[PDB]
Structure 1
Amino acid sequence: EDFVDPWTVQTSSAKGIDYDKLIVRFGSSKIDKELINRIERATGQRPHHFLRRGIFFSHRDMNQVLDAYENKKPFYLYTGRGPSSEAMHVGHLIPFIFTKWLQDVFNVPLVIQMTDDEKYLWKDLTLDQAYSYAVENAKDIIACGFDINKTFIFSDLDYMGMSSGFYKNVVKIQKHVTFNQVKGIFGFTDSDCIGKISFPAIQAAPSFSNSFPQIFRDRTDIQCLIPCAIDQDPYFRMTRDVAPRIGYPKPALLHSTFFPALQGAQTKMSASDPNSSIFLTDTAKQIKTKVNKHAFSGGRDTIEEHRQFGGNCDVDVSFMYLTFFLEDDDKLEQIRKDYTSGAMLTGELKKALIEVLQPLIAEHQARRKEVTDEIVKEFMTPRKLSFDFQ
């Protein structure tokens, strides 16, 4: 009942998908209180709200990452973006917001893959468009605050032709994965182009440190941690499988839930449905309108009934959004209590969310405007990142 994969995301329950059942089906492990406390201990920092609230709820070998970090051994962060267009919605920002926190708390180098080739193979795009979207989307990623001296954002199309180690790993991986394997993992068929069939190796490749010689200089032992939306897991479930078969360490994973579509947690927000998403370029006006008109309500139909019986936070999309963006834990709790008791009407809850998203988006736009051509260029230039590994 919780179908999930690299592109599509379906579920049939207003409360969202059953992530506990998904963990089991994926074979990953749940992020428990014990692990959350160990992360706090290891770092000396209070865990990000995404972890406290179960937004990042699943993982693979995080224990290993914590071991390595506790023993002063290095590890690096790796995440990515499919640049399907210049238009990005708030849902896309979840993993990046978290990765930025990860990079600050652990203080480690970050690698961000821009799959312009992926999007070229799958969508009706020109190479220039695809590449252009990677560069434009990179500005939105840089707007999240990543340290220019600790992070390399790269275009597949560009980097493939300027790395003495990337393509090499891509081939090693290509040899250790069959068509049957990828047909079962991603659902490919005989009619798909050969580019799609072999693509997974591209996305698997950045999991190995020697893919970035200008960063790790031939070392093949640095632990890799991949924070991503749960639906990306099949790429790395595959990656973890081949790693050993080719003498490389398995990458660790940190999974996040889906950011809800405006009409209900049954679907994730997707540009493939603009009415379901809030875009990073939406005006203050459009944000208010989308929330007021499209945000599914867990409250009662009439205000009288709402006062009498109170609302249901478990299916209310507006409350769900506050869960992702309202940092103050007490403020959120009060709203939960007041909404549940009917003390707060959905219209007010709605107003509350709007007052949170508008500044968030307006601020992101302000930051994005600050990334100049020279800045994007540097971020996207293979180079050494203030960190010595040898």
Structure 2
Amino acid sequence: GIDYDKLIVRFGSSKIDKELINRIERATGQRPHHFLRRGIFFSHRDMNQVLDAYENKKPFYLYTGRGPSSEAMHVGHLIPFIFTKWLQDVFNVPLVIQMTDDEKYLWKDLTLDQAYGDAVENAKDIIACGFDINKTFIFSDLDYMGMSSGFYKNVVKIQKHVTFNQVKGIFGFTDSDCIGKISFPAIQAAPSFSNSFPQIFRDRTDIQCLIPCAIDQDPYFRMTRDVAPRIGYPKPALLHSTFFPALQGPNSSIFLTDTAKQIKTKVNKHAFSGGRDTIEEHRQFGGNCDVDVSFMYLTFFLEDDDKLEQIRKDYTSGAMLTGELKKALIEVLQPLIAEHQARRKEVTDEIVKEFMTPRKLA
């Protein structure tokens, strides 16, 4: 499939090797998450710096976000949230999650209230991922900007040190775009600096930030990292993941709303197959796990490394047929999604409100 080792060279990032993974295990005392064991999160920037601080009792915080969608969230979207939740638990650090409602308002046909409405709704799905309410701040840009003595100030600092020419290349803007889009990159970068959240870190500016993201986003975070020293702040560290495969690449992906029945259908009739044409060729040459979306999905959601390896072998040999594989996946997805919907149902307005209230995170 995709040659991720080349993307590392292309972007200039660092490969997450076994020694780093072992160091993470020693620092936390926890077994490394399966995304690390399987190369899902394979690249980074300054992770050793983060561990240097952590090992010396100098904590950091996590930062991630989400563009509020009209309840159009699929299993692929779970990846960074699942990893961020794991990072939060094993390092036991605070986390800030930005809901870019102002971004959606600027890019989509929505009123400011509708954009905000989508953000609060999406927040429920994020809360359903299990983040600890005592250490997690989920904020709406539209709301938080007007109730922070540090966020806007950081936005302006960034705005002063980034030119249109710079963002034009990185984000592909043209002078036909509204000024709101042009300066937005500063708002997405501001959360990377601790003094943007006074209610959490007060006036401290030395608390390193760690951002889990997709490798193809490295160019975007490069802007934030380059501006950091220019404004006297530490650069945020990054952890890069691979690309979540499209079902093939309403039926282009499996949504967190889909029912058990819908999940079955999606996998059996739409999930791309890496097996052979006829059962004759398959029992001989076997199936290819590098392109079979059904198996790739398993590498992300099946936690048992042993069962996953067994399924791989039998699918590559021919002993196991595509239909058998797709059923193994369905047995993994149905409960995964069912449990998410169940937890989402428990998210009360009182809960979402608390998560969204700027407050100290003991």
TM range (shorter): over 0.9
- Aligned-residue offset at 1:107: 0.2
The Cα RMSD (Å) is: 0.9
Deviations 1:321-365 (A, max 9, x none): 000000000000000011011110000000000110010000000
3-state DSSP class of the match of 1:181? helix
Native 8 Å contact 1:204 1:235 kept in 2: no
**Count of aligned pairs between the two proteins:** 362
Per the TM alignment, residue 317 of structure 1 is displaced from its structure 2 partner at its CA by 0.4
1:84 and 1:123 in contact (8 A); partners too? no
SS, match of residue 44 in structure 2: strand
Asked if structure 1 preserves the Cα contact closer than 8 Å seen for 2:73 and 2:255, the reply is yes
Q: Distance in 1 between matches of 2:244 and 2:39?
A: 12
Partner of 1:10: none
**TM-score relative to the length of structure 1:** 0.91
Structure 2: distance between partners of 1:90 and 1:229? 15
For residues 96 and 367 of structure 1, what CA distance do their matches in structure 2 show?
A: 15
Equivalent residue of 1:277, what SS? coil
In 2, Cα distance between equivalents of 1:141 and 1:256 = 19
Aligned partner of 2:346 in structure 1 is: 370
The secondary structure found in structure 2 opposite 1:153 is strand
**TM-score with structure 2 length normalisation?**
0.98
- Counterpart of 1:253 in 2: which secondary structure? strand
Q: Is the 8 A contact 1:85 1:130 kept in 2?
A: no
C-alpha displacement of 1:18 = 2.2
Question: Deviations for 1:246-286, whole angstroms, at most 9, x for unmatched residues?
Answer: 0100000011112110003xxxxxxxxx3221000011111
Q: Which residue of 1 aligns with 2:103?
A: 118
Report the alpha carbon displacement of residue 151 of structure 1 after superposing the two structures with TM: 0.3
Q: SS of the residue aligned with 2:35?
A: helix
CA distance in 2: counterparts of 1:25 and 1:179, whole angstroms = 24
Report the Cα offset of residue 17 of structure 1: 2.7
Quick one: which of 297, 305, 314 aligns to 2:281? 305
CA displacement, residues 95-121 of structure 1 (integer Å, 9 cap, x when unaligned) = 000000000000000000000111111
Contact 1:203 1:235 in 2 (8 A): no
Output the CA distance in 1 between the equivalents of 2:73 and 2:225: 29
Alpha-carbon distance, 1:71 to partner: 0.6
The answer to whether the 8 A contact 1:143-1:367 is kept is yes
- After TM superposition, the structure 1 = structure 2 runs for residues 63-142 of structure 1, keeping only pairs within 5 Å, are 63-142=48-127
Cα deviation, residue 230, structure 1: 2.4
For the residues of structure 2 that align with 1:25 and 1:104, how far apart are their CA atoms? 32
- 1:267 corresponds to which residue? none
Shift of 1:35: 1.1
Deviations 1:282-304 (A, max 9, x none): 11111111111111111011112
Sequence identity percentage = 99
Aligned counterparts of 1:149 and 1:230: Cα–Cα separation in 2: 30
Contact 1:165 1:213 in 2 (8 A): yes
CA contact (8 A) 1:131 1:155 kept: yes
Cα deviation, residue 237, structure 1: 0.8
State the SS of the aligned residue for 1:57.
strand
CA contact (8 A) 2:13 2:44 kept: yes
Greater CA deviation, 28-37 or 358-367? 28-37
**Contact 2:64–2:97 (CA<8 Å) still a contact in 1?**
yes
Judge conservation of contact 1:79–1:112 (CA < 8 Å) in 2.
yes
**Cα distance in 2 between the residues matched to 1:190 and 1:26:** 27
Unaligned ranges ≥5, structure 1: 1-15, 265-273
- Going from structure 1 to structure 2, the CA distance change for 1:332 and 1:302 (only over 3 Å counts) comes to same
Q: Equivalents in 1 of 2:121, 2:319: separation in Å? A: 44
Q: Deviations over 1:298-327 (max 9, x none)?
A: 101111221122111111100000000000
In 2: Cα distance, 1:120 partner to 1:154 partner:
16
> Is residue 62–residue 253 contact of structure 1 (8 Å, CA) maintained in 2?
yes
SS at match of 2:139: strand
Alpha carbons 2:69, 2:122 under 8 Å: kept: no
Q: Deviations over 1:7-46 (max 9, x none)?
A: xxxxxxxxx4322221222111111112111111211111
